Symmetry: C2
Subunit: 318 residues, 2 copies
């Protein structure tokens, strides 16, 4: 493969500039591949309509996306109606794989989407992007279509001068990756919502639910296809919606848990619970967040079970 | 001890308002204890003066700090001169424990200060605070003085509703503590630079050099004296710096490195290098930071070793 993250970063980082969409459209036509775009959507009424439009506008210049799926979290904001009125196929995350009960977050929606994706290639895109430029859809298709061994491509980009990701990327994922999965240290936006791979690949790895899904997918793909078969594409600028630091804390915990879970199955981490530690202190699903408030110090408690879905291949009608 | 972070939280969180300085001064005197205040300092000529001044004013009201140590990273802004001019003792981080060579960052300075601290208690204080109110000095002394079994006290506070700390604390320390050291999850500012413990405790644990020092101390104190012997005190509002996110990434890494190390030693973590990963990818002191710029993607590469100084006890006295 590649001797280092440095070597990979050399050979496997592209620019959307290198993949004009008419070329891709042509190449895609030649290969007879179809693409499904999947938009995990939760209260994005104000933005999905615009994204669906832009993908349609792009398909006019260059036929690249055959299916547009909005997988809705039963948003209270009318998201589903909005996406439907703009021409996307819309599904409820709770109606897909209904045998699994209600969806546990973004990861669960993304997994369940596989049950109705018809494309040879599955392309995930975030539904909340404000100013959606067309390369936020087609850029990552470049290397899958054009570079021989590449099976999985993640987006790279910058906040509208040097961007190393949002807070969770910078302070959680990158430090955890550098230490535990150094092979992934080369990725500019390892937690990006926009990335693409063949449907068969996604269908044959498990999916962490909740916010841990990207982290889990990075690790699982790395292990399945190898570093040389992953790539990234600079896509330019991408405005993302800032979250409250306090909520990001919970996301950071999900990323930690995903890494910890994987380390444990590799055997690098054993006896996760330190001996001598009374069981009462031990409950992974129980996140304690101590804060200071105008009226005193408080201990907030969040409970999120780390639910993991099996490779959908194993659980879905063949 | 306590049965959960929640029980600890109710029993070992206080408000500085519970500890009027004049009462602290009385108890300190009855117990014959002395307090050393260490200010690890690098380029803070603009703020040390104020801090030192506040401490001296506090002591007039209530004699609480017996020694003020500015341990200076040989700043070029004249930190040393200001501190000296304002009445504080001044030391070069490089001259203390010089057998270990020049100093590896903030932790090293804090460790080396243990060789010149005369107090029974040692109070570390950040020297870059813009608006130093009295309770930043005395608040954390409350529980060590007043609650016999308490040996270690961390500050708690909030920026100018709910505040769960700075970016590194929220996105790195607290996630990691919740998973691997649940006993520390009740701390509001576990990475706070204001904390106090008895000299003997500090002299009995190792100190990570650099940015990981607070994380290491939290963990090693926890293992050494137990969660019951730790406390926090609400000091009110403290204004915070806006370090750059790109710099904070290296800091988060140090924090992760520190936890990982402790996990290796406990046996929880082994074969840290994936069994099948070429040594070309394996260099813990080598942090790869991939970034996007106007000119394209760049892979930045920082280096900082993790250095652990042993307990000063093993080298001294
Ligand atoms: N169907 C569904 N969609 C969801 C859910 N939660 C979030 N989404 C959608 O998934 C997209 C991104 O989720 P964000 O909550 O906006 O994530 P982020 O703050 O932008 O942070 C980033 O890092 C995460 C780490 O994994 C990523 O998951 C995420 O994609 C994003 O890149 C958005 O379109 C959002 O509506 C859910 O529970 N169900
Ligand atoms: N003596 C010494 N002091 C330092 C060093 N680095 C930081 N400090 C001081 O430690 C305090 C906090 O520094 P810093 O780590 O930047 O604070 P933070 O970014 O808010 O966590 C300040 O008073 C700094 O001047 C160092 O290498 N040597
Ligand atoms: Cl787990
Ligand atoms: Cl769980
Ligand atoms: Mg977003
Ligand atoms: Mg817990």
């Amino acid at each position: 493969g590649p001797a280092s993250a440095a070597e990979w970063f050399r050979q496997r980082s592209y620019d959307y500039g290198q993949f004009p969409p008419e070329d891709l459209a042509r190449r895609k036509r030649e290969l007879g591949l179809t693409v499904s775009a999947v938009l995990p959507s939760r209260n994005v009424a104000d933005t999905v309509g615009g994204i669906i439009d832009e993908i349609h506008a792009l398909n006019e210049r260059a036929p690249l996306i055959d299916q547009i799926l909005v997988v809705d979290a039963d948003s209270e904001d009318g998201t589903a109606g909005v996406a439907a009125s703009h021409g996307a196929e819309v599904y409820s995350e709770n109606e897909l794989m209904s045998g699994y009960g209600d969806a546990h977050g973004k990861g669960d929606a993304m997994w369940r989407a596989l049950s109705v994706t018809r494309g040879d290639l599955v392309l995930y895109i975030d539904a909340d992007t404000r100013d959606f430029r067309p390369q936020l859809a087609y850029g990552v298709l470049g290397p899958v279509l054009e570079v021989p061994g590449v099976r999985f491509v993640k987006a790279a980009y910058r906040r509208p001068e040097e961007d190393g990701g949002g807070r969770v990327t910078e302070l959680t994922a990158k430090p955890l990756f550098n230490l535990f999965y150094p092979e992934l240290a080369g990725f500019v936006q390892p937690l990006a919502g926009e990335f693409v791979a063949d449907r068969e690949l996604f269908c044959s790895i498990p999916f962490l639910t909740g916010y841990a899904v990207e982290t889990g997918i990075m690790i699982d793909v790395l292990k399945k296809v190898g570093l040389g078969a992953m790539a990234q594409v600079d896509l330019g600028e991408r405005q993302n919606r800032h979250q409250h630091l306090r909520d990001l804390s919970r996301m950071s915990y999900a990323v930690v848990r995903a890494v910890a879970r994987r380390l444990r199955q590799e055997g690098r981490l054993q006896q996760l619970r330190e001996p001598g530690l009374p069981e009462s202190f031990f409950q992974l699903s129980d996140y304690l967040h101590a804060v200071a408030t105008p009226e005193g110090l408080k201990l907030q408690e969040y409970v999120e079970e780390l639910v993991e879905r099996p490779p959908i291949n194993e659980v879905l009608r063949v």
